[model samples]
Every structure is written in C-alpha cells, then in structure tokens.
Target: MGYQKIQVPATGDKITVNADMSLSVPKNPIIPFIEGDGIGVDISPVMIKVVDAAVEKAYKGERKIAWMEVYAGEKATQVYDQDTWLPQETLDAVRDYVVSIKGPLTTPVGGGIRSLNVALRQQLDLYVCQRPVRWFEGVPSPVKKPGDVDMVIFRENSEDIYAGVEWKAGSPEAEKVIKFLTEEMGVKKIRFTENCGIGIKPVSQEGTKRLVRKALQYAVDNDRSSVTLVHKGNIMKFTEGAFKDWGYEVARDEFGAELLDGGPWMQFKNPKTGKNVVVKDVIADAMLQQILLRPAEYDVIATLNLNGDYLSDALAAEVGGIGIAPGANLSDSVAMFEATHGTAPKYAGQDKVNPGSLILSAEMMLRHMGWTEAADLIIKGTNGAIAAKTVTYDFERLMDGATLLSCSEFGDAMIAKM
Candidate 1:
C-alpha cells in the first residue's frame, strides 16, 4: 500500500505485526496520529509531550517514538479538500503503521455523513472495542468503593446497530421491509408502520465467537476471575440471545469450559494460574445495576456492539467519569488508541478540559507496544497528580478547595509527579 499525499517519516521503521500477531517494535517506530477536532487541538500536543517524556525517562535515550502525523476529521478537510473529511491515504498510513493513536473526531448531528470514528473502525475491520475502566486513587467518584469498579470491556465493534444498517422513515425500503415482516414473517409489533424508520441488527456465530474468544483469552492472560456475557437475550432472542449462547460455545469449545451448575453459566481453568475463570451471562438491564451495586463481581466483559457502548460509559461513571476514561479499537493485527469522549468543540483551544482521557489512552498505547515501564510511569504520574488534588476544572469543581489547573497545567503536574 502506498500513499500519494501523506508522507512517511524518513527515519523511523514501521511497526510490524508478526504471523502470530506479536509486534516487532523498533526503538524508533513511526506512529501515525490524528490530532483530531475541537479540543483535540489543546490535548493532542500535551499528550505527545507526556508520552515523549515517559519514553525518554523510562528508556533513558535508548529508545524513542518517531511520530508521523496523519490527517483526518477537520484537519483532513483542510489538508485534502472541503468535501474530503477522511482520505484513503490516511487510512493507508494507519494500516501500514500497524499501531497508532488519535484524538476525538467530530460527528455531525442530524445526519450529514457517518461518524469518522465508525468509518475508521470499519475500514480496518478493527472488530474489538477494548475499554478498560479502573479507578485512579483520589479521583472523585460517586461510588462507595471506586476501586472495586475495575473491569475491561471487549465490544464486538464491526456489527449490530453500529454497523449502520438502516432505512429512513417513509422510504420505499422501510415500507417494503415492514410489509414483509407483517405479511410473511408475522411481526406485528411495530405499531406505527406508516412513519417508522427501520434498522437491521446483525449478530452472527463467527462475530460472537471471535469477540468472546478475545475476552476469554484476556481473562486467562491477565488472571482475571470471570468473563460475563452481557446481553438483552430475553427480548431480542435471536440476535442478542444467540449472542449469549454463541459466547458460551466459544468458551466451551475453545477454552474447554464446563457448565457450572447444569446451565447457562460455566467455568474453566485458567491456563496461566490454574484458578477458575467463570463464564457467565446477565441481562443487559440487570448488568447495568450490577456494575453499580456489585461491580467487583464482574471482571472481563464480552458483548455485542450496542451493549458494550452503553456499558463502557456507564461503568466509567461508576469509578470517576469519562473525562479520564480511555479506549482502543483493535483487531488481531492493528491497534488504534483514542480518547473515549466526544469532541467538545466549545472547549477547543481553551485549555480548560481534562487531558486525562487522551493521556491515559496514550498510556494504553505504550502498554500495547510492550513499553510497560513507560506505561507504568504514566499511571503513577496520573495517580499522583489526582491524589495531590491538583486537577482541571472538572475535578476542581467537584472537590473541596482543590487547586484548579488548566489542561496544559494538569499535564505539567503529571510530569512533575513522575
């Protein structure tokens, strides 16, 4: 794959993904990054600075990242043309690099174009949306024990409502599908057939198996206690129900899991630690309450696209908030880390918003590349800053008599802590 407009870095080697999916990261691997839209302007530079500091401190001049800028979102429009928001060369650069990170891209309201985030995920078939939510010490929380709210989410990214299969209301396609459901398939539940849009929810055995396999593998790799299959199976039996069933099938067939108490939930021996890794299921609605009430019970989560999207943010709030939340979109071969929150356009260049999201996301990126020392330093720095009560307005307003730091100042505080 070649890029016409995007220039590859002259001095850095591309990170190679091996046949076994292990990464061959050079001391100076070229990493592509999208600066993103809105407040991305404020946070992106700070994230790069923090990451560079960590790598330099951890490696002590033996290794460093050579960052290559790849345009997308508002930046892409300016670089390419007015109508071109996402360029093929940018996608090529990301695929070629194998590991990258980006800031939050803007999504237009009322449906002008599809989400750039969704488009990037679909383009690469990055089928797993990996979000790990854990509490930072001294971070303000709504829960009694924020430390108990640690769990990693593996969201089936490429399918379901996020796949964008839908028909507008009053369109011929919507009318045809509705008529078919009413006449041939006997689906009379749609009350307002005259003016209702339709969406196709796709859940497949292959998709379910791949997603659960990753979640279960994660549980085994990290020595986690359990992997809960969250779904709305009782109502949407075929789509969501099949998801739960297929999830268990992956656990049993791939990992040699056995039924725990004669049904639905099951257990398997962790190959790494020889402890039991329970495979369980819960209704999506109940799982929501369970995270708040019994969060320690859940460890690793595997579910369909829509369920994971809702669960990620909901669980983030349980500990602190999404302001500090981080996430990654991954396939077996390529990974792209990004801030989990939306682009707050009003806060652009104001330096008032929290950069924790992108900074922690870069932390995850470091860990992903086998740079554990740098990643650990980031975690320690972030924890130290929050513990000292030096924070941005988000935490300052919530905490009593805390010093209010701007976005850049918060990044500086984190570095000082390290």
Candidate 2:
C-alpha cells in the first residue's frame, strides 16, 4: 500500500538498540510493517487498528507508534514494478528501523525465484525464527491442555537444505551427482522429479552457535526454565544432529549453564541417584507425540530449517490451527513478526477470514518495539474479546456459545475492547 527507502550506516562494531531508526530514543517507536499477500488484506488492517487502539487506550496519549507502511508481494509488484517480491526498499526499511511485522507472502514454487522468506533471512542474516506456543483461554486446542504448551522455538533460519543448492534429476548435471552418490560413493539416491532440481542445505557452526546463544539469552532474560535442542539427528546426523550438539555446547560454554534433557529440572530425576532434574532428547518423530502427549515438557526449542518449519506448523494446528499461530523471524536485535498461516486469496476483500495471526503478531511487534504498554493492552483486549467468544468463522465453529462475526466485526470488537 506504501513504499519508502532509508539506510543504516554500517558499523565496524555491533549496532546497539532496536528502534525506529530515527537513530534515537523518541516520543514513540516508529516501526515499518508489511501487509503480506492475499488474505494479508484481511489481517494487516485489523492488526494496525488493534495496535493503535491499544496504545491510545493504554497511555491516553503518552506512548504511540509512528508506523510507516511499506509494501512487498503483489502490492509492491503492482505499483512499484518491483517483481522481486521482496524489494530492496522493504529490506532497507526493516534494516534501518530494526523491528517490523508482516503477514504471510506467497512463495514461488519453481525456479527463477527462490523463497522471498528465505532470501530475506539470508540477505539480512535474520537467523532466528522465534515462535512461542502458548494457548489462550477459550481457544480450541487438540491437545489435552494447549495452555501447557508454552515454549519458544528458535529455528535456525539461514542454514540447512534451505540453502537452495540442489540439482534436477533428468538434467545432465544432476545425473553426474547422482552417479557420484550411487556408483562411486555407494549410497542410494532419491529423486523428486524426473526433471528434478538440486536443493542445497548448508549449516555452519557460526550460524548454529549464534542461534543457540540467542535462544539461551532469551531463556535467561525471560526467566524461562530451560532450552531444548529439537532435531532429527538420526536421519540428518551431520546437519541436524550437529545442531543439537552445538546448541548444547552454547548453553554450556557460552552461557555457563547446564542443558536439561526435557524441562523443569525440578521434575526430572537422576537415573543413578533417583533425584529429579530436566535433561534428555526426544527424536524428531517422537517430538510430534510429546507435543501432543506432554507439551509442558519443552520450554525453548532450537532446530534446523525443515524440522522447525514442520514442527511449528503442526504444533500450531494442534493448538488452534493456523488461525492463531503467530511467529517472528528475528535476528539478534531486528525482528519481523509474521502470520504463520497460508494466504487465502479467494477470501481476499470478502473480510470473512480470521485475522488473529497477524493481530497477535503485531502484539509481538509492539512489545519488541518497546511499547509494552501498548502491547499489553492489545493482548489483553484481544484475549478479552476471544474469551467472551466474539469471533470469526474460524473460531465460531470451534467455540460454543459464541457469536459469529465477520473479520471486520472481529477487528471492531478488538478495537472496541482496546
């Protein structure tokens, strides 16, 4: 809907402060936000309204957001002739501003264009994808107690097979590689398509260590009980398995802390002495079960790219489907809160879809922007509305004794509550 450009002078040393990039503390925190593709139309506006109402109600004019709207995806592609999907100007704004939020965007499936999400993280080195799964009261959860699953996920975004290095099966180049693995290397090969392509996945110690370090820092800062490294090391040992080892080392060496197998050291027991402590590993497949069976067991999870992607989506579905799954792609200081749901272009402009994901993501955005007063009010107001069972079709079917509301009505309800 809008576009702008700004630059942050590179520092020889670390850049301090997460901010509006006015480059100073101000009367308010200015944030650049992106309304993503398709149903992003439904979500972004609601989120902005909720945030503004919250800030205005909470501070009564004391704190606010100097929000600058930016564009990407179809919006930018249409007006700016920016076919790149994630344009340079958008990245520049986020880099200068330090914190921003977005709804989901379309990821072009074939070649020519790699993932816009992947490109952003790689280009900016936004290595950490943080997802906190804490169920709110009245939200429908498949698990016995969705509220028990209050854990933050630190997914290493920039590494692994998502590195985009792979060859197509029918191509001569792919054939040579397949021959090397199958004939000379004596290893079996798998093919996605007869005309398959190559996908490169790279994991570096530097990336994993820093990601784990950030996970530990978050746990310590938030007074969280433990940090767990979730991985499918058995199959992807060198990459995923190494991630766990490196993560544990970060907790031990960098943080001067001990790694617990599960969560709550108070509840775990020493096998030798029969004393309680939290520490252990659950295989990737097994983790799916644990999330359903005992979600309270995890606190902070660090894992590779695919594992993180699969785990986050599945977990979100269990709790409340994609409708309430909020996520953030973040680096050390800069963050971009985003909707963890798919784009529904069919419902575009109909205002019939749920906007909870983006709205909650903006709650994260507000808090990250240091407008906690505004953030808290937004969260409380949304929760109040949901708890009262004022919801859209997504929630309406699942929630009993609820009044079905349009997406815009839900926004109005949230704003009214705010």
Model 2, 307-378: lDDT tens digits are 888888878877775677778988766788888777888998789899888888888766555566777777
List the RMSD of every prediction in angstroms: 2.3, 6.0
Name the lDDT value of residue 226 in candidate 2. Answer: 55
lDDT of 2 at 411: 82
Clash list (residue pairs), candidate 1:
none
Q: How accurate is candidate 2 locally (lDDT)?
A: 0.73
- Top candidate, metric lDDT: 1
Please give, for residues 117-139, the per-residue lDDT of candidate 1 as tens digits: 97788778889999999999888
Q: What is the lDDT of every predicted structure here?
A: 0.89, 0.73
Off by over 4 Å in 1: 2-5, 107-112, 168-171, 189-194, 261-263, 272-275
